[PDB]
Symmetry: D2
Subunit: 333 residues, 4 copies
C-alpha cells in the first residue's frame, strides 16, 4: 500500500484510523500545525468514534501505532515533503487547500507516485466506488474521491436511474454539524448563516453534491441539484431525494431494486434496511449510503421521495482506502 497522508484533520485522522483497521499500510504523515505529541492525543481520543484500542505513542520523532512506525513531517508547502524518503507512494491529500491537479502535483516533486484528493476537485477526475471506478486508468496521476455526500447520493441515483430513469430530481441533505461551523454566533464572512450558533440552530447551507453527481454519472448532468440543512447532531447525515422517474413503478419495485443492488454489485457500498432506524444506528457504519426503506414515500407512479443514511466521516474515509486499493490493483498491474 505505501500510503502517505497530508493533513491531520477529521479526515486525515480517520483515514489513518480506517487504514489500520482495514489492514492498509500508512508510512508517513505530514502536518505543520500539529506537534507530534498532540498527534498521539488527537488520534487516540475521538468524541464520536471512541478511543483507539491499540497502543499509540511517540517513538524518536515518529508516531508508533500498534508497532507500525509512521514517520512524521512538518512541511508547510506540499512540494517540500520528502515522501520518497519515508517511502510513501500514494498520497492522500486531505488538507482541503491543494484540491486542483495544478497544486496537488506539488507532491510529485517530493517523490510521490499518485495523489488522491479527499474532497471535490475542479479539474481532477472524480470517482465514487461502486459507481464509476471502471473509468480509471494508470495514466491518471491525480484523482478525487468526491465528497462524503456525493458518495451517498451517487449510489442511490445510479440504482434509480438504471432501473426507472431519473428525469429530474431535487436533493436535500439534513447534515450533522461540521468543523467549519461556530459554537456560538461568530464571524463567517464567506457563509453568513454558517457562523450562527451551531448547537441551537437549523442552518440552511448549500451543497455541490448533486451537481457533482452529474460528473460521476454523465447522463444525470444538469438533472439534479439541491441544498442542505445543518442540524445540531455530531455525526451521521441523511439524504432526502425527491425525484421524478421516467418509467412508472411501485415503491416496492424501488425497494426491490435497492435490496438487489445492496447484495450484489453495490454490496459493501450501498446498504439496505427495513428497520426503524435513527441517526445513531449508523455511527461507525462503513457503507457509503444506507437506503431506509420505511422512511421514503411515493406520491405517484413517477413521483417518489427516497431516504438514505450515511456516516459522513466514517463511510467516506473507508471509501478513500477502497479507491487506493483499486488504483494499486490497476497500477501495480
Amino acid at each position: 500500500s505505501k500510503i502517505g497522508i497530508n493533513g491531520f484533520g477529521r479526515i486525515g485522522r480517520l483515514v489513518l484510523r480506517t487504514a489500520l483497521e482495514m489492514g492498509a499500510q500508512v508510512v508517513a504523515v505530514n502536518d505543520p500545525f500539529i506537534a507530534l505529541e498532540y498527534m498521539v492525543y488527537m488520534f487516540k481520543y475521538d468524541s464520536t468514534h471512541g478511543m483507539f484500542k491499540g497502543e499509540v505513542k511517540v517513538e524518536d520523532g515518529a508516531l508508533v501505532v500498534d508497532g507500525k512506525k509512521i514517520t512524521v513531517f512538518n512541511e508547510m508547502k506540499p512540494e517540500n515533503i520528502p515522501w520518497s524518503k519515508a517511502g510513501a507512494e500514494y498520497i492522500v491529500e486531505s488538507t482541503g487547500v491543494f484540491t486542483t491537479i495544478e497544486k496537488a502535483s506539488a507532491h510529485f516533486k517530493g517523490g510521490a507516485k499518485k495523489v488522491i484528493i479527499s474532497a471535490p476537485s475542479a479539474d481532477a477526475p472524480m470517482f465514487v466506488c461502486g459507481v464509476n471506478l471502471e473509468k480509471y486508468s494508470k495514466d491518471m496521476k491525480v484523482v478525487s474521491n468526491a465528497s462524503c455526500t456525493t458518495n451517498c447520493l451517487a449510489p442511490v441515483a445510479k440504482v434509480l436511474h438504471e432501473n426507472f430513469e431519473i428525469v429530474e430530481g431535487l436533493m436535500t441533505t439534513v447534515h450533522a454539524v461540521t468543523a467549519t461551523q461556530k459554537t456560538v454566533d461568530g464571524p463567517s464572512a464567506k457563509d453568513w448563516r454558517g457562523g450562527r450558533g451551531a448547537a441551537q440552530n437549523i442552518i440552511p447551507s448549500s451543497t455541490g453534491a448533486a451537481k457533482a453527481v452529474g460528473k460521476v454519472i454523465p447522463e444525470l448532468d444538469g438533472k439534479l441539484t439541491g441544498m442542505a440543512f445543518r442540524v445540531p447532531t455530531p455525526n451521521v447525515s441523511v439524504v432526502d431525494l425527491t425525484v421524478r422517474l421516467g418509467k412508472e413503478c411501485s415503491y416496492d419495485d424501488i425497494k426491490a431494486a435497492m435490496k438487489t443492488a445492496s447484495e450484489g454489485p453495490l454490496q459493501g457500498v450501498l446498504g439496505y434496511t427495513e428497520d426503524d432506524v435513527v441517526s445513531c444506528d449508523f455511527t461507525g457504519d462503513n457503507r457509503s449510503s444506507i437506503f431506509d426503506a420505511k422512511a421514503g414515500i411515493q406520491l405517484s407512479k413517477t413521483f417518489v421521495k427516497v431516504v438514505s443514511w450515511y456516516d459522513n466521516e466514517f463511510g467516506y474515509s473507508q471509501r478513500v482506502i477502497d479507491l487506493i486499493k483499486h488504483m494499486q490493483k490497476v497500477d501495480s498491474a
Copy 2:
C-alpha cells in the same frame, strides 16, 4: 371574547399567554393533573419563550394574571366542566384526546357555546387563517385549527397553486423536538423511532400535514404528501416543499408572488424574508409561515423547491386566537 381553555400543556399554556398579549379574554382553565400552585409556575417560566412579565399568582382557588382572574377547574371528564359558571363560552380544546366532534361535544353539556380543537380532527371542519376562513358559518359548533405544520404549508401552497398551479408535491419538515419524544432511548410502542434519544438523533417521523392541506384546499387533495425529520432543537421548524408546477415560471416570479401575498391578503399570516436567517431568528415570531427567499432553489421552469419557517409553538397559538376572533365576529354578528 369569554374564552375557556381545557388542558394546560404547551399549547394550552402558550394560548393563554398569547391571549393576554393580544388582549383576548380568558376566564377559565381546566386541567385535572396540575395543581393550582404548579400552574403559576409552569406559566411564569418557559425555557423557550422566557419569563412572563406581568404578575402571576394564586388568589382564592383562582389564577390571577395581571389583575385578570381566571377560575380554575380540575375536572377529568369534559362533560363535567361547569364552563357556564365561569362564564366561558368559547372553549379551546387542547388536551389532544377529545379531537372528534363526537367527544368534543361533551363541553356543551357544561354550558359551552362553541369548541375549537387545537389539533387535527377526523371529522370537525379544519381551518387555516388566511386560507379558508370564508367557509366558516355560525351553525358550526365544533371546529379545528388543524396542526402547527398545516398552518405553515397551506399558506405557501395556496400562493403557489393560485399563481402557477401545483400538479404534485412532496413535503419534508425538519421539525424541532416534541413533548412526545424521549430524552434517552425509551419505550414508544406506537412509534418505535419516536422513543429514541431525541437529543442525539435525527428521527424520521410521519406527518398528516400535507394530506390535511387536501382538506383546507380541496383542489390539492391527493396531490401532496410528506414526512418529517425530528432534530435536536427546542423550537422552530422549517418546511421543505418540493413541487411540480403546471405553469412555467422563474424563481423570481415565485419570490414576487410570495412578497405580494405577504403584504396583502396573507399579511400577518405569511411572512417574507431575503435575509440569511436561521432557526432562532423565528422564536416568538407570530406568523403562520415565513418564506425564506434565498433558501429555495429551482431546477427547471416547473420543478422548484421552496423553504418556509414557522415557530411551531408560538405561531400556532396566535392563530388559535385569530380563529376565535373571526368566529365571534361572524357569530355575535
Copy 3:
C-alpha cells in the same frame, strides 16, 4: 449463573447486554409492557452504545441472542413470575418500583433464590464492589447495588479516607440527562425543575448518593452530602468532590494513592488517568469511577477537590454482574 432480569429499561437491557459480553448466563426476562418483537429491537439498537453485534431474534415466544435462549414473561406483579420454570435463581430487580425488602420478596414465591435491586433501597443491604463486599453473607436474600453515582463516589471516598481520613465533604455531580426528564417543558409534579426542557437547561437536582456512601462506608456516615446538576449530554457523568482531610498531604500523595489503588485492590473498579480526557472518552468504559488527575485542584494541605468520571449506564451494569458473581461464589460455597 442462572440470572433472571425483571424490567427491560435502560438498566435491564444493558445488564443483559453486559451479561452476554462478560459471559454470565441470563435465562429469563420479564416485562409486561414490552412485546417480544419490540424487545429484539430495543436490545439490538442503542443510540449511546451501538448496535449489538451478535444475532438477536424471536424464537417461539423466546428471545434468542447468539444461540442463547431467554424465555420471556409478561407478568405485571412480581409474585406471578414463574422464575423457577425458566430456572432463574438470581433475579436482577431493575423495575425501580420493588426496591424494598418487603416488596422485592415477591420474587421468592415465584421460585427465586436471591434478589439484587439495581437501585438504592430503603432497607436492603447496599453494596459497592471494591468497597464493602466483605459485609455480605449467604443469609442475605435481598440486596442492593446502590446507584450508579454511589458506585462512582464510594471507591474514591474509600481511598481518600483510608489514606488521609475524610473529616467532611460536599459532593456535586454534573450528570447526563436521565430517562425521567422531559424533552420540553412539561409536568413533573414531584420534581418541578425536573420537568423543564432537558436539552436547553442546566437543571439542579438532588441526590442520595453521598448519604448512601454513609451506609457502605459507616465511618463516613453523616460526613458527606451533595446535589446534582443535570446537563444536556446523553451519557457519562462526572463527580466533583470537595473534601476536608484529617491529615495534611500534597496533591501528589493523592494521585499516588489513587494510582496505587487503581492497579491493586480496586483494579477494574477504580480507574486512573492523567490524560486530557472529556465526557465522551468514557462511553462504554466499564469501571465504576475514573480519577481524573489533572482536573482536581488543591487549596491547602487539607482542603482539596477531586474529579472522577463514570459512564452512568455501562459501568453500573457491569458492577451488577460482578456483585452477582461474588454472591454466588459465597453462596454456592
Copy 4:
C-alpha cells in the same frame, strides 16, 4: 457618555446593544475583520438574545441604530484608531488581545481618555460593581471589569464573608459553551480538552475567577480557588461554591443575609430567588449573580455549598456600562 468600542465579538456587540437599551451613548466602533454590512447583520440577529427591535442600517460608511450614528473604523492596531475624530473618550477594550496596561494604552495615542478592559488583566485594576468601586480614582487611566464569572462570585463571596467570614473555599463553575470552543474535535494546542466537540462533551476547564476575587476582596486573597466544567448549553452559567465559614450559622441565616443584601446594598447586582429555576429562566437577566436559595445545601454549621446563577453574556455587558457610568461620575466630577 461618549463611549467607544474596540472589537465586535459577543461582548463588543452585546455591550453596544446594552448601551442603547440603557441609554448610554456609543459614538464609534472599531473592528478590522468585519465589514460594515456584516455588522448590521451580526448586530440585528442574535440566536440567544433575539432580534434587535429598532432599525439598524448602513449610512455612508457609518452604522445607524435607531437614528444614532456610530462611525466605524477598521484599524488593525489600537494605536491607529482615530478615536478623538469620532469624539470617543471612554474606550471599551473587548478584543481580548490588548488586556494589559502596557498594550491597552495604545488607545491613548488615538485620543482616548480612559480604557476599560472587558476581561481580566494581569496588571490593570480590576473592579466589580457593588464590591470594590469605591477603590477607583480619576488618576486610573486603564481599568478592568474582571470576568463574567468573577462578577458572579465576588458579590456572593462578599456577603458570605462579611456575615460569617470565609475561611477557605473551592469553586466550580458549570459554564455554557464559549466562542473559543470547537463544534467538533479540532486543534486547540493551548487547551487540549478545549478543542473537543463542545456539543457532545462535558469539558473540564480552568478559571482564574476565584483567584481574581482575591484582588477585588483582599481579605480573601489566597483563600479561594476553583475550576470549571463546560457543558453544551448556549448561554447562562451557574457557580457552585463550597465554603468553610468562620462563624457557625444555619442555612436560613445565609438565605436571610442574601435576601437582605439583594434588596439593599447589592440591589440590581445580586439577585435572590426561592423558585425552582433552571438555566433558561436567566437569559437576558441583567444582574451579576442570582442566589438560588433552594439549590444550596448545608452539611454542618460551618460547611455549606451555595449556588448562584448568571447570564454570562448579558449580565456582564450590563456591568460594563455601569462601570463606565460610575467612572464618569467620578471623573467629570
